[PDB]
Write a protein that binds this ligand. Structure first.
Ligand SMILES: COc1ccc(N2C(=O)CC[C@H]2c2nc(-c3ccc4onc(C)c4c3)cn2C[C@H](C)N2CCOCC2)cc1Cl
Length: 117
């Protein structure tokens, strides 16, 4: 199942799945930039979340060819969702928004991954 991908071929296949998340309004709004614990008054954020991730950083990594293989991109999207579910209470708006994005991503990513082999 080893395959070498060109970064531009990955960017072209995967960026639409990331665009699908950015289009979710308001559910993508918390996810568009890195969590700033100072600005948001959540000083315990980096006690809990040791590997932060957000849409801006994933987009930057696609734009600079830092994903060799499609599973590395999927791992960062899942990291972003797993961090939000870990930090936020199950009852919170951000947790619910995370769950919405995860549903959208599952629908978008499945056929793209099948198409990349
Ligand atoms: C419309 O949706 C929102 C509006 C405001 C807020 N916020 C507040 O109620 C207070 C601060 C602000 C806010 N919180 C968070 C927050 C917090 C905990 C988090 O864990 N993981 C993540 C990701 C995460 C994000 C982010 N924000 C900024 C807020 C979403 N703004 C982003 C810029 O456009 C306007 C709305 C959250 C949401 Cl969901």
């Amino acid at each position: 199942r080893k395959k070498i991908f060109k970064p531009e071929e990955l960017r072209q296949a995967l960026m639409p799945t990331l665009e699908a998340l950015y289009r979710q309004d308001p559910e993508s709004l918390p996810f568009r930039q890195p969590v700033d614990p100072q600005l948001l008054g959540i000083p315990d954020y980096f006690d809990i979340v040791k590997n932060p991730m957000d849409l801006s950083t994933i987009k930057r990594k696609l734009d600079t060819g830092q994903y060799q293989e499609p599973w590395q991109y999927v791992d960062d999207v899942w990291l972003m969702f797993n961090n939000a579910w870990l930090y936020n209470r199950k009852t919170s708006r951000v947790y619910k928004f995370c769950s919405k994005l995860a549903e959208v991503f599952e629908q978008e990513i499945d056929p793209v991954m099948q198409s990349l082999g």
